[PDB]
Design a protein around this ligand. Structure first.
Ligand SMILES: OC[C@H]1NC[C@@H](O)[C@@H]1O
Ligand SMILES: OC[C@H]1NC[C@@H](O)[C@@H]1O
Ligand SMILES: [Ca+2]
Ligand SMILES: [Ca+2]
Ligand SMILES: [Mg+2]
Ligand SMILES: [Mg+2]
Ligand SMILES: [Mg+2]
Ligand SMILES: [Mg+2]
Lengths: 570, 570
């Protein structure tokens, strides 16, 4: 039977999306700080890797308190990264190579060094109500003893309320003291968000990652007898009143009103795509929330439409080296069971806020994890370094610069909080500072294992994480991966299968031993697998090379061993 | 092609198992109390319903403090239910009809009126160490105040430690003061459990339900410097130190040592079966625990073999009227994903300790829930009344007799705790006391809806819960249900499918709208469903009767509506 034609999908429905952390990708000018000229110089890397789309962490003007998530000017480039002209060059060259480019949009908060905040604190007309400003809580017990409006706790520790001597009021910060929460009930704030997105779409951005959306809106004091209501206490004894986890964020996170803002953004974007034509511009939302609250980002039962997708963080939050094959299957099934019909699935294995994929799992699991990412239906999301199996870098207390570690931690505890280990410079090669920089003085220390783990080494050697990555992004061109069904089950506590099948097209089968022990399985239990079949990709430690023929229905897999098999059509 | 032949399964691998609560099934002698002669008089009901096996709640000599779970003689019958002769007659007549009969084995504890406890409290040789006896915790600062050995809390509220004046020590009771915990580190206790099981297997019992196994073993004081260690505090403000929920049962529940006892019971039972022949005698374990601790009842990765299965309580603990179709699918997938390879799955929708199925869900969902039970692979478990859709009965504070309600509750709270609503007498017909008794003075009040919900009415009327139950138990004789594959996915937030398929055999498809709203679905999305197909079973208010032909790919389902479709073989 001739292989059926499939209707090609819009680019965003099955792209490989790569997150760049610009400060740590490529330093072009020897200051130990990654920059836009650095990115331009290695845009060819994304073509070589089989990446369709890049999203950059924030590159806008910022005092760098939260390394770019504290934005003082939403309309220009951070000087350490380069100039507006460098950004326009990046977009032109990325587009020439057929890549899509997404920017990190940070709508929840602005730098306390923004004109928005300076004018708001000064009560200039039109800015007075731009942020959440609150009087001290009345103190009938001791009148005029200053109390915060409520018990709300910052994501970076301490009160979410900061006193302004100038304004004689508290402002809200869910993040750092320097990150001031906008009032999303103010129509002028909502207009300014459209102004920012229009500016960057007009420059030719292909869309946005939407930062920290669960924290957009907090309880209206009009609904709580003219005060900000206290969040419920957790009652967990390990947390004092200044420590994140002391409260349950009932009045400060996942408010139903936030989704109305997201649906308004999507309406604006749909209108922009209709009026401008060309490639669909998209929004992908960031929010760590339960399944119900996560799926509302897609849209609601009234038929409102939201983000093209909310990020799926399940491989960060719900799986690790403690997981067995049944855990892998049960967590993979969660997105696919709960996602609305017509929704596009996505898979995230890492980001700049979490430990690196091989550290959360094991070094011998890198290939199997990248195979899951690329072989599951929908969109594969890769964090800078996953394509070469980068591990967390050692960062001392002395070298730690993450506000979350510095605010929540001390020399003895900082490792529980710090995001710095996942932000160490990218391993290009075995030259000074792993080819990230010509300087030995990098903004974070280069990981100690860059001699063993670097892109140039993996491009030369016969078998590598990066060559596996390339083989997998290439496989995504096949109709079976773009349009095929999926079947996923555990064969044992150690090994699971994932079958992509499509009548008249080749069958692809992942077999993954996620355990630390050898496992023998009966391939006769795998649906749509006829033997003999051919190894397409194997873990770097597999006895099987690509082109190896599987003939026996009895298969032994070593600890961490993953195979992709190519089998005849069904 | 002619239909493939299937190998006969051992009876326990696909039985319909019905839980009888004897006190509430049938009263033969007008005292308002269900009894063995009553059960004998209605054994024909199980044949009529298509039940393969019955298990009875406890019928052994008991002061009835916990209505039979407080046993004073494990070797004789409770006088209110009948005599040993009545029990032997029940086994003879059940076996003559082809039924298996299992007993409720209560190994964790004995009545304080048992000879074991009387002798143990008297420090009689051979009995002194039969229960968990402990000295008060030293009170150096305040030696005039006796302290219990630890902060452990009873499942029925209050301290798990009761002072014995006679023995001048505390004994452990995880359940009622009158339910004394055996010492499962005592070889003499372990031998007595074999003696009890052998006694009843020798009488002709086909196996046991194993009661309350998570509570078998508690921390050894030898591991905690000669004291019983305190359970950790929950920190939940709604519970004071005498209230269940005050502690996390780290030292009192799910200890790894309990499974070694279960594996020893299975070894004993395998040897008994080997030495006796005839129908395999089985054990089904009761335990409410997390997934890991539940699956250890089947066996362990080292090859130990435990219960034939642990009960699956997921439709009690994890699904309700709050659940949508995606929840139904994700919870059904939990047992099927985590159960060990070669394990027999089972499905429990109710029991005498939980609210009745139609009360936990909705009255309009009874048929769909009975269809899930019967159509999923493995063993269907039915609690007395589910075959006619019995609802919780109203029980006033004055009529309440459940120790858990009387200990934990008051006239204002009792309803939060009481199990009595699920124990009201069975609805045979619309006669006095719904045909359960000739007496109006029933041990619990007959539910007010018995004239509307009763077996005789459902046998006379053209469409009924009972007639659907009969059709479904009949359907389980088909190779597609005994040996077929399964596929389960949600079509929407409201409707899911469950497909049973087997090459050369008819395909069976459940479609169930679990929502309170209508839903229209595309049957083209259902695997292995070729149209036209025939309605095999419909919910009692479905627009479609058994025999109705489904021709259109678009299907509108009412709230609660459930269909089983019969479709051509794959
Ligand atoms: O902007 C708030 C937070 N979202 C992403 C994190 O890196 C940042 O601190
Ligand atoms: O025997 C202890 C407990 N297990 C079953 C319940 O009905 C009983 O109270
Ligand atoms: Ca906010
Ligand atoms: Ca015990
Ligand atoms: Mg630089
Ligand atoms: Mg963290
Ligand atoms: Mg009676
Ligand atoms: Mg299939």
């Amino acid at each position: 039977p001739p292989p059926t034609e499939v209707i090609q999908l819009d680019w965003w429905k099955n792209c490989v999306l790569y997150q760049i952390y610009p400060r740590s990708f490529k330093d072009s000018d020897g200051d130990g700080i990654g920059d836009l000229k650095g990115i331009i110089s290695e845009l060819k890397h994304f073509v070589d890797a089989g990446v369709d789309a890049i999203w950059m962490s924030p590159i806008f003007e910022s005092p760098m308190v939260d390394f770019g998530y504290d934005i003082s000017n939403f309309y220009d480039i951070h000087y350490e990264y380069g100039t507006m002209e460098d950004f326009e060059e990046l977009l032109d060259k990325a587009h020439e190579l057929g890549l899509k480019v997404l920017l990190d949009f940070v709508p929840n908060h602005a730098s306390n060094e923004s004109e928005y905040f300076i004018k708001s604190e000064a009560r200039e007309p039109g800015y007075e109500n731009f942020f959440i400003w609150a009087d001290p809580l009345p103190n009938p017990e001791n009148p005029g003893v200053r109390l915060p409006p409520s018990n709300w706790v910052s994501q970076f520790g301490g009160s979410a309320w900061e006193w302004s001597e100038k304004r004689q009021q508290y402002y809200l910060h869910q993040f750092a003291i320097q990150q001031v929460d906008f009032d999303f009930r103010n129509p002028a704030v909502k207009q300014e968000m459209f102004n920012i997105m229009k500016f960057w779409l007009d420059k030719g951005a292909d869309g946005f990652r939407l930062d920290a959306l669960p924290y957009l809106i907090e309880a209206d004091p009009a609904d709580h007898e003219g005060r900000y209501p206290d969040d419920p206490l957790s009652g967990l004894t390990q947390f004092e009143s200044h420590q994140l986890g002391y409260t349950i964020p009932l009045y400060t996170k996942d408010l139903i009103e936030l989704y109305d803002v997201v649906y308004e953004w999507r309406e604006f974007l749909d209108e922009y795509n209709k009026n401008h034509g060309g490639d669909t511009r998209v929004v992908f939302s960031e929010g760590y929330a339960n399944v119900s609250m996560t799926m509302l980002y897609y849209g609601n039962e009234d038929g409102a439409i939201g983000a093209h997708f909310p990020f799926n963080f399940d491989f960060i939050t719900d799986l690790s080296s403690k997981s067995n094959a049944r855990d892998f299957v049960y967590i993979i099934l969660r997105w696919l069971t709960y996602m609305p019909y017509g929704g596009i699935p996505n898979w995230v294995f890492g980001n700049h806020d979490n430990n690196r994929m091989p550290t959360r799992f094991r070094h011998d699991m890198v290939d199997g994890l990248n195979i899951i990412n690329m072989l599951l239906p929908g969109v594969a999301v890769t964090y800078q370094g996953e394509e070469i199996g980068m591990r967390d870098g050692y960062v001392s207390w002395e070298d730690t610069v993450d506000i979350e570690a510095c605010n929540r931690g001390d020399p003895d505890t900082y490792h529980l909080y710090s995001r710095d280990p996942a932000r160490t410079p990218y391993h290009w090669d075995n030259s000074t500072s792993a080819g990230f920089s010509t300087s030995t003085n990098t903004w974070l220390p280069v990981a100690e294992d860059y001699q063993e783990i670097n892109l140039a080494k993996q491009k030369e050697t016969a078998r590598s994480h990066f060559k596996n990555y390339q083989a997998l992004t290439k496989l995504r061109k096949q109709a079976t991966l773009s349009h095929g069904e999926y079947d996923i089950r555990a064969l044992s506590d150690r090994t699971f299968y994932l079958v992509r099948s499509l009548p008249t097209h080749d069958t692809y089968v992942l077999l993954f031993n996620v355990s630390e022990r050898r496992d023998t399985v009966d391939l006769g239990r795998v649906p749509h697998l006829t033997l003999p079949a051919t190894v397409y990709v194997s873990s770097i430690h597999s006895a099987r090379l690509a082109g190896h023929e599987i003939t026996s229905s009895q298969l032994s897999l070593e600890a961490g061993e993953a195979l992709v098999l190519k089998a005849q059509p069904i």
